[PDB]
Design a protein around this ligand. Structure first.
Ligand SMILES: COC(=O)NC[C@H]1CN(c2cc(F)c(N3CCS(=O)(=O)CC3)c(F)c2)C(=O)O1
Ligand SMILES: [Mg+2]
Ligand SMILES: [Mg+2]
Ligand SMILES: [Mg+2]
Ligand SMILES: [Mg+2]
Ligand SMILES: [Mg+2]
Ligand SMILES: [Mg+2]
Ligand SMILES: [Mg+2]
Ligand SMILES: [Mg+2]
Ligand SMILES: [Mg+2]
Ligand SMILES: [Mg+2]
Ligand SMILES: [Mg+2]
Ligand SMILES: [Mg+2]
Ligand SMILES: [Mg+2]
Ligand SMILES: [Mg+2]
Ligand SMILES: [Mg+2]
Ligand SMILES: [Mg+2]
Ligand SMILES: [Mg+2]
Ligand SMILES: [Mg+2]
Ligand SMILES: [Mg+2]
Ligand SMILES: [Mg+2]
Ligand SMILES: [Mg+2]
Ligand SMILES: [Mg+2]
Ligand SMILES: [Mg+2]
Ligand SMILES: [Mg+2]
Ligand SMILES: [Mg+2]
Ligand SMILES: [Mg+2]
Ligand SMILES: [Mg+2]
Ligand SMILES: [Mg+2]
Ligand SMILES: [Mg+2]
Ligand SMILES: [Mg+2]
Ligand SMILES: [Mg+2]
Ligand SMILES: [Mg+2]
Ligand SMILES: [Mg+2]
Ligand SMILES: [Mg+2]
Ligand SMILES: [Mg+2]
Ligand SMILES: [Mg+2]
Ligand SMILES: [Mg+2]
Ligand SMILES: [Mg+2]
Ligand SMILES: [Mg+2]
Ligand SMILES: [Mg+2]
Ligand SMILES: [Mg+2]
Ligand SMILES: [Mg+2]
Ligand SMILES: [Mg+2]
Ligand SMILES: [Mg+2]
Ligand SMILES: [Mg+2]
Ligand SMILES: [Mg+2]
Ligand SMILES: [Mg+2]
Ligand SMILES: [Mg+2]
Ligand SMILES: [Mg+2]
Ligand SMILES: [Mg+2]
Ligand SMILES: [Mg+2]
Ligand SMILES: [Mg+2]
Ligand SMILES: [Mg+2]
Ligand SMILES: [Mg+2]
Ligand SMILES: [Mg+2]
Ligand SMILES: [Mg+2]
Ligand SMILES: [Mg+2]
Ligand SMILES: [Mg+2]
Ligand SMILES: [Mg+2]
Ligand SMILES: [Mg+2]
Ligand SMILES: [Mg+2]
Ligand SMILES: [Mg+2]
Ligand SMILES: [Mg+2]
Ligand SMILES: [Mg+2]
Ligand SMILES: [Mg+2]
Ligand SMILES: [Mg+2]
Ligand SMILES: [Mg+2]
Ligand SMILES: [Mg+2]
Ligand SMILES: [Mg+2]
Ligand SMILES: [Mg+2]
Ligand SMILES: [Mg+2]
Ligand SMILES: [Mg+2]
Ligand SMILES: [Mg+2]
Ligand SMILES: [Mg+2]
Ligand SMILES: [Mg+2]
Ligand SMILES: [Mg+2]
Ligand SMILES: [Mg+2]
Ligand SMILES: [Mg+2]
Ligand SMILES: [Mg+2]
Ligand SMILES: [Mg+2]
Ligand SMILES: [Mg+2]
Ligand SMILES: [Mg+2]
Ligand SMILES: [Mg+2]
Ligand SMILES: [Mg+2]
Ligand SMILES: [Mg+2]
Ligand SMILES: [Mg+2]
Ligand SMILES: [Mg+2]
Ligand SMILES: [Mg+2]
Ligand SMILES: [Mg+2]
Ligand SMILES: [Mg+2]
Ligand SMILES: [Mg+2]
Ligand SMILES: [Mg+2]
Ligand SMILES: [Mg+2]
Ligand SMILES: [Mg+2]
Ligand SMILES: [Mg+2]
Ligand SMILES: [Mg+2]
Ligand SMILES: [Mg+2]
Ligand SMILES: [Mg+2]
Ligand SMILES: [Mg+2]
Ligand SMILES: [Mg+2]
Ligand SMILES: [Mg+2]
Ligand SMILES: [Mg+2]
Ligand SMILES: [Mg+2]
Ligand SMILES: [Mg+2]
Ligand SMILES: [Mg+2]
Ligand SMILES: [Mg+2]
Ligand SMILES: [Mg+2]
Ligand SMILES: [Mg+2]
Ligand SMILES: [Mg+2]
Ligand SMILES: [Mg+2]
Ligand SMILES: [Mg+2]
Ligand SMILES: [Mg+2]
Ligand SMILES: [Mg+2]
Ligand SMILES: [Mg+2]
Ligand SMILES: [Mg+2]
Ligand SMILES: [Mg+2]
Ligand SMILES: [Mg+2]
Ligand SMILES: [Mg+2]
Ligand SMILES: [Mg+2]
Ligand SMILES: [Mg+2]
Ligand SMILES: [Mg+2]
Ligand SMILES: [Mg+2]
Ligand SMILES: [Mg+2]
Ligand SMILES: [Mg+2]
Ligand SMILES: [Mg+2]
Ligand SMILES: [Mg+2]
Ligand SMILES: [Mg+2]
Ligand SMILES: [Mg+2]
Ligand SMILES: [Mg+2]
Ligand SMILES: [Mg+2]
Ligand SMILES: [Mg+2]
Ligand SMILES: [Mg+2]
Ligand SMILES: [Mg+2]
Ligand SMILES: [Mg+2]
Ligand SMILES: [Mg+2]
Ligand SMILES: [Mg+2]
Ligand SMILES: [Mg+2]
Length: 46
RNA sequence: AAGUGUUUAAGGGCGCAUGGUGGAUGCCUUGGCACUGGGAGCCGAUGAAGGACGUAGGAGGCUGCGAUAAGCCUCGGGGAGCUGUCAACCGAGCGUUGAUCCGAGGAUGUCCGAAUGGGGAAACCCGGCACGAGUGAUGUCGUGUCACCAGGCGCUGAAUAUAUAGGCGUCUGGGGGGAACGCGGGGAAGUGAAACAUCUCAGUACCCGUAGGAAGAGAAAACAAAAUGUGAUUCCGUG
RNA sequence: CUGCUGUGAAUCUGCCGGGACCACCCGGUAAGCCUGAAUACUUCCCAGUGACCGAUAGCGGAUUAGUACCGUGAGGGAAUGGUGAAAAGUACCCCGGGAGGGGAGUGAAAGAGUACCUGAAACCGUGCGCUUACAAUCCGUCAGAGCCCUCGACGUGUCGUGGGGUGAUGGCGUGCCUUUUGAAGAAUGAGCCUGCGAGUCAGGGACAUGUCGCGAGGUUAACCCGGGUGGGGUAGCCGC
RNA sequence: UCUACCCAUGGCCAGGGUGAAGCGCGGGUAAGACCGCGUGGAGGCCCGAACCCACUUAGGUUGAAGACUGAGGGGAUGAGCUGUGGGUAGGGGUGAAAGGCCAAUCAAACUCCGUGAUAGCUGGUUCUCCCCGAAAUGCAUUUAGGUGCAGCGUCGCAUG
RNA sequence: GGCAGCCAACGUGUUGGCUGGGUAGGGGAGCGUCCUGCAUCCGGUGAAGCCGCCGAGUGAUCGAGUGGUGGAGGGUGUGGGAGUGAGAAUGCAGGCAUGAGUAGCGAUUAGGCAAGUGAGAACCUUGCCCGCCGAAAGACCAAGGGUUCCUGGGCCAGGCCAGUCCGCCCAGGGUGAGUCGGGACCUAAGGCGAGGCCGACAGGCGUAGUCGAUGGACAACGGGUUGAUAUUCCCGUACC
RNA sequence: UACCGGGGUAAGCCUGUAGGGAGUCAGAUAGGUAAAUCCGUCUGGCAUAUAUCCUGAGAGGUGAUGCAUAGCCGAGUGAGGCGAAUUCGGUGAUCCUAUGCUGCCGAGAAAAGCCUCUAGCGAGGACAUACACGGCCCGUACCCCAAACCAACACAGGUGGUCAGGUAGAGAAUACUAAGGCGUACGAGUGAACUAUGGUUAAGGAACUCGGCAAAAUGCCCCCGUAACUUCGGGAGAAGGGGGACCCACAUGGCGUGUAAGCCUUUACGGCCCAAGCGUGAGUGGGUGGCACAAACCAGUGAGAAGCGACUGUUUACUAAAAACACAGGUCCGUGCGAAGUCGCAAGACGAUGUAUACGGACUGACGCCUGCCCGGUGCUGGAAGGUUAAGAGGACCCG
RNA sequence: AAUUCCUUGUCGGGUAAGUUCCGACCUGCACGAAUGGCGUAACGACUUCUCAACUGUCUCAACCAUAGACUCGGCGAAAUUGCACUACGAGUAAAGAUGCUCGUUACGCGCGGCAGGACGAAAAGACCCCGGGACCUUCACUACAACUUGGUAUUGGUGC
RNA sequence: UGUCGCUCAACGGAUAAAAGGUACCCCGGGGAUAACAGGCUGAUCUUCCCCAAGAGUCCAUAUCGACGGGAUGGUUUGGCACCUCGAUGUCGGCUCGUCGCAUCCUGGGGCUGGAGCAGGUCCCAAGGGUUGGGCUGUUCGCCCAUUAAAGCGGCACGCGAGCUGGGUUUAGAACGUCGUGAGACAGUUCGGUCUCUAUCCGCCGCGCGCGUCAGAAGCUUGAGGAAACCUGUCCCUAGUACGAGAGGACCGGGACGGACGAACCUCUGGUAUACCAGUUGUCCCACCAGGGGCACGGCUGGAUAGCCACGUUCGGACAG
């Protein structure tokens, strides 16, 4: 009986790992935002 | 007496007649696809591309707009109906003294975003200075302005003498985005070779730096072959 | 021709090219810069076209679509169009808690009722006819009794150049596909229906073979001029 | 955001045993060594809940559950367990080392792109009829279930 | 007695002789589907599609032969062009069978009766009993969730049965702080990082700084009140 | 006389008890990136006091004529009014004094804040009382061991922290139970086989089986009594055995606590003693009852010997927990210091704010007794007399 | 012997009976000294053998309760599936027949049960072979990083 | 033009240039190809036979039968590669069986180098029976007590959609050995997931329907099936027959058992969830007394009926 799942939600950690400001820090992340915008995604980031 | 002999359908099968389910088929379309001829080929610190949150007399989505919020002003068009739409229903109003609507030019344009007063988990937290408003005063509220770097111009010139590095002040720029096309750099592998390393795939995919409306190239230290030759570059057809 | 690393000249008798190199001729004048047109492309805007698609097609997206939904994230990523000319969308009555239905209305039609054009098949019912509970069945086929229906002539049913439905009973009879020397095979694939799903296209390409034009000649490429599919264009190419 | 290890900062460990060093006193001695009796409360110490494990067994095995449940079992002041916040990234990480683990996937994660990768291999390839009609041999082969040429089919032309 | 291929014989297409099992495979000739140039014809006096009847051809198949359904296009001839034919790929999408009215309906506590509500009650409400947890199955939070909370209404989806009930559907309402938990205070690991150093470019590190609680500092307690908030509102008494 | 329910009330502000912690004044100084009366350091004088001061549980007072409450009125929508007593003891924390104290080795954040010192500001300024005022932003509903979070489900799994009633009990185990909360969402029947989960069993007692797998057994407290061997710690709860209930007496006893009275004094939040009252074992003697006195639940099986590994630990998330890994201990090799090693293209970083008693790598693996022979092969270390050997130099001779 | 092929070696012990176990012998297929040798108190959910106690493990099984199973009401799946009014024997066949031959047996339809067959279901056999991958090794080949040699540039002066 | 340079010898000559491991394995394929089972064959194996050289004092043939020869069977090891690699799970044990006779016991016989008892060998016979333990994963085998006897084989070496999982044969680890190494070993050692709700046939049970020439009811015949079928010891006959003795019967009678099966519950014994009693902890019924709830039916001592075996009774014939 270990029963611990992989997804342990934490909103701060979500933002710090996947958030808008993180993405914008690097060229790769900025490319991600541009690509999702080009696809027409409503949500560009976490 | 012996012998002959129909006569059940619990249920099933097959055929037909009537239905259900389902959404094929036929015929369509407010949507696509491939192209042709034109236009425009950039937008951004005067804050972009794209967003968050708001905004109509009534809940939400799409559309429009930004606290002046389905809108404000001006110049033109237009001519009887209008208050975007899903979407009506109710409740109120405008318009021949020209509404709704269409075109052009202005005004307003919260917050986030290069994001740039400082900070931050984008759209939310906290300020300096100047002017104004408001308080009995503190608190509070408007409107400007305050990142960094590069390059002009002015002042100053450390250790240290000459000086210089640097430090103040001020003006002018840059930053980010965009489907393809350009130029200059970096540069695979699957694969082919019926194995594989040279070679191929291929200077392809991808990546980096920069453009422009196109770019690059361009005005012979060129070709040619004895012809009394041609005469910048680019691009197309041949060879 | 050109990068990096060394070395390192001449100013016209100079120097650099004419596929190692040398000589002779020829061409040109490096180590400075700028330069339009012919060429490439279309996020976006305007006007059009199609021997292009027509809702499992065409864009992933005709429907809140890059949405719902999936993933921590990069990222992945659907499904859903048609009433009728007009909403005239069924007042009112009846059964029912509703749902739904039956009368009555509207409509050309409700065999058009917001579950809506047409309404196939699988699949699921109800009714009628024949058949089936002593039988061993790849499920059918060829003979065939009996019953039911129908078309002719005759008469009360009975026969025919008949036609259908069902079928007691007899003979014969080992699914389909793939793949194998050989499979009913106890080898592979298929639960069923509907829809979709595989030799296509480009190039004066190559060889062959039809066909058409011209013929010792045939033909143009780019390009130019026509709102066209037409006219022009000799560079080439292939024969000789 | 699972998991491995590390960094910073917090929390948690019922109850009951055992009795190290040190200290004190009394024996003992010339002084000691040494020996009793207290005090003391040490330890990857003992028994045992929470908590952390997963040893044996039965059940589950289209589960209640993509790893669990019941019954017993081990550790339980420590190389302990745990919260919050943080760090290391793919030929790389981390590993008290099982090639373990790195989001139910690991002898090289996942996603998109090159990309419709390539398969001498397996499967599939859809209407009809008319005429003809094979081969499973020879030679060679990084060849033996592949392929080239020959042999054997067909269509056309020629020769009869 | 019908059809066909090859060949012969003559004729302005008939007669005769021979031949006609067939996988891989070669050759020949056709059927059906769609889109089109041209020419013709049919169609609200009812096109296509679909379901039948009665018939037809050597086959793919046909019916400008006819009923029913249906509602707007279709046929034919001759040419041009194909997303042109499926039964099978453990093929794909949708619909639906078989297993089958079968297995299950998710613990280790357990329900019973009376009365009420209602169209309907084993499951909803109230009362009286019974049973279970009680280092929890009680009470209060962080994380996470996001209106699930309260009142009124609802009962065709959802709830593994039913349902008048619901954590489900609908409308309205509800969250009040100088002291609580955070910011405006402080720093840890770590992150970012003016200049800077390093690195072909992309970038890698890092100084001054500036962020970053799980820690440091810092002022409120008891009582009452709403259907739903309370160290927040109110009362009493405090503190910064 | 028996029984049931009450037998309540915070922060703050007074007061400064238990406990803990402290010497003070004077002279000199540029060590504290300038200065200092502060701090540090050095020299002198005066101190061992219940002296003084700081800190601090709690008792007591106030807060409180208030608030709250057992009940009682009527009256039911459930709102409203009235409202007693409130003493003394015992027991007792995992909470407080306590960031204390004592012990130990592994030697145990930072910054703000607060205090103080000058530098530097200064003509105005400090303090107290009264009155009138400002005190921003975000969260605040509800669930939160769960059908509201992570689990595709109204899923037997998972989820950190804070409260801890009573009787048995060592206990937060376990049994029953209070407050509070549930009966949790398919049911009703029915003695089929069979499966699952529990229960009992004549006689026998491992004959079962790969194997005592699974069950059964042992189990608590207080006494008695315990071997080989040993690293002298252990082994050890070794083994083996006895007692345990209830009533009465000893007992107006013993022990803990401690009021009245009394005694002492530094008279106060003092000290000594203490009948009563309350709580509480252990033992001894006699009796009483049962089949059974650890009464249920709870709760070691023990012994002899061998192999491996010394030991506590660690490991294949999801078939292996071990003899594998780790380990303390050992030896070798490297490393003289932005070391060696490692990450990185570099800068830079870790190693380490370490310096050979250190750090890295390798093999071995507590401890005891020990660890022989071989340097031919292949590595590693050192050497360079020979053989061979790149680019760079040279440039004979030859060829156009 | 965790090492011994022959091998259940041989002798002793334990048992009524011992291929395992304990003590020895040495004929070590094929122990041996930090891939340490031989021992070792303590320790072990390790592995092995023996004994006491205890028992449904067994002789040998019986009975009780609960949850399913079963019946009634409600809701309502799944894997599988070319067909179907799906007997048996002895044969025959791609050599193991419900489906072919000859014969035998058998009224139609269900319910509860058992698992011999349907070469039952699941999963394009993990074995083996053929073709292709991957990762690992090394005195296989060819490269590259890193390290290292000399020349030359940065790089100079005076002396021997 | 002439000629030279290749153990390119894998010699039609893939590169000028190349070895291994995988039990950590993965994918595409094959029953074109092995490991299990089936099938063919039958060398080998097995069972029997033909000839009779000899052995047996003499005497081939009571009993053995050399050298050679001919076959059966198809359970051994093989040979072959025909079905199955889009899956036919293995050894041993357990449970349940079913068939053959080449018969282990019991039954019936011939011949004996059969006096008797007890045997040897061959023929006929398959109804029933054919034990429990120690060692090993074992099959096999050896051993310990018994027995009338402790038969040999087939059925996918019967039986894992019935169970087990000790051996073997995944991944961990270790020893010896081999390999420079990754690794390897029909060498050894410790450890290591055994899935499935039964549609069809088949089998065990139980109903519904219809039929058997009207609708019903009681009692029946038995075509045809199924079950059952074992055996010992002791005492008489008899210490007789036979025999030197030792020893010791056939045939025919009687009693008492083992194993197995059936029915049954009087007895003995087991069970007992609404029976009675005792008793611990706790909560409750205000309280005492008396009771109840919960803790395995709390625990403990008993326990009629039902069900049951360890119990009771009966069976296997007798005759044709
Ligand atoms: C594991 O299941 C299957 O592969 N199923 C598919 C086929 C193959 N097969 C089978 C079974 C076996 F047990 C063996 N054995 C015997 C024991 S052994 O001596 O260890 C050697 C291996 C075999 F070779 C083939 C079967 O039954 O069907
Ligand atoms: Mg421009
Ligand atoms: Mg900003
Ligand atoms: Mg910033
Ligand atoms: Mg100067
Ligand atoms: Mg730019
Ligand atoms: Mg290749
Ligand atoms: Mg290839
Ligand atoms: Mg230009
Ligand atoms: Mg030249
Ligand atoms: Mg230029
Ligand atoms: Mg359609
Ligand atoms: Mg579409
Ligand atoms: Mg993922
Ligand atoms: Mg998401
Ligand atoms: Mg109509
Ligand atoms: Mg419909
Ligand atoms: Mg319709
Ligand atoms: Mg009949
Ligand atoms: Mg027959
Ligand atoms: Mg026949
Ligand atoms: Mg074959
Ligand atoms: Mg063939
Ligand atoms: Mg088949
Ligand atoms: Mg079949
Ligand atoms: Mg195959
Ligand atoms: Mg299939
Ligand atoms: Mg311990
Ligand atoms: Mg673990
Ligand atoms: Mg099951
Ligand atoms: Mg233990
Ligand atoms: Mg413990
Ligand atoms: Mg300690
Ligand atoms: Mg993190
Ligand atoms: Mg391994
Ligand atoms: Mg994983
Ligand atoms: Mg790889
Ligand atoms: Mg490619
Ligand atoms: Mg392909
Ligand atoms: Mg022919
Ligand atoms: Mg060929
Ligand atoms: Mg033919
Ligand atoms: Mg013929
Ligand atoms: Mg063909
Ligand atoms: Mg047609
Ligand atoms: Mg009409
Ligand atoms: Mg049409
Ligand atoms: Mg097609
Ligand atoms: Mg189809
Ligand atoms: Mg299909
Ligand atoms: Mg069905
Ligand atoms: Mg069934
Ligand atoms: Mg059933
Ligand atoms: Mg059921
Ligand atoms: Mg339930
Ligand atoms: Mg009622
Ligand atoms: Mg209920
Ligand atoms: Mg209870
Ligand atoms: Mg509610
Ligand atoms: Mg309500
Ligand atoms: Mg409902
Ligand atoms: Mg329902
Ligand atoms: Mg920092
Ligand atoms: Mg940095
Ligand atoms: Mg910078
Ligand atoms: Mg901060
Ligand atoms: Mg904090
Ligand atoms: Mg509330
Ligand atoms: Mg007080
Ligand atoms: Mg009072
Ligand atoms: Mg609340
Ligand atoms: Mg949920
Ligand atoms: Mg749950
Ligand atoms: Mg408890
Ligand atoms: Mg529930
Ligand atoms: Mg239930
Ligand atoms: Mg039962
Ligand atoms: Mg017994
Ligand atoms: Mg007994
Ligand atoms: Mg035994
Ligand atoms: Mg046995
Ligand atoms: Mg044994
Ligand atoms: Mg056990
Ligand atoms: Mg037990
Ligand atoms: Mg001992
Ligand atoms: Mg007595
Ligand atoms: Mg160990
Ligand atoms: Mg221990
Ligand atoms: Mg351990
Ligand atoms: Mg595991
Ligand atoms: Mg395990
Ligand atoms: Mg270094
Ligand atoms: Mg070494
Ligand atoms: Mg070791
Ligand atoms: Mg031995
Ligand atoms: Mg021995
Ligand atoms: Mg040595
Ligand atoms: Mg050694
Ligand atoms: Mg060792
Ligand atoms: Mg263990
Ligand atoms: Mg039941
Ligand atoms: Mg039912
Ligand atoms: Mg058969
Ligand atoms: Mg047939
Ligand atoms: Mg079953
Ligand atoms: Mg069969
Ligand atoms: Mg199968
Ligand atoms: Mg395969
Ligand atoms: Mg293999
Ligand atoms: Mg390879
Ligand atoms: Mg050759
Ligand atoms: Mg040759
Ligand atoms: Mg070659
Ligand atoms: Mg495979
Ligand atoms: Mg074969
Ligand atoms: Mg098999
Ligand atoms: Mg075989
Ligand atoms: Mg077979
Ligand atoms: Mg062959
Ligand atoms: Mg198959
Ligand atoms: Mg015989
Ligand atoms: Mg008989
Ligand atoms: Mg077998
Ligand atoms: Mg089986
Ligand atoms: Mg291994
Ligand atoms: Mg070696
Ligand atoms: Mg184990
Ligand atoms: Mg084993
Ligand atoms: Mg009879
Ligand atoms: Mg019969
Ligand atoms: Mg019986
Ligand atoms: Mg009786
Ligand atoms: Mg009673
Ligand atoms: Mg009471
Ligand atoms: Mg009483
Ligand atoms: Mg109770
Ligand atoms: Mg009893
Ligand atoms: Mg009894």
């Amino acid at each position: 009986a270990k029963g611990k799942r992989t997804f342990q939600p934490n909103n701060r950690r979500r933002a710090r790992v996947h958030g808008f400001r993180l993405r914008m820090r690097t060229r790769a992340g900025r490319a991600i935002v541009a690509n999702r915008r080009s696809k027409g995604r409503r949500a560009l980031t976490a």
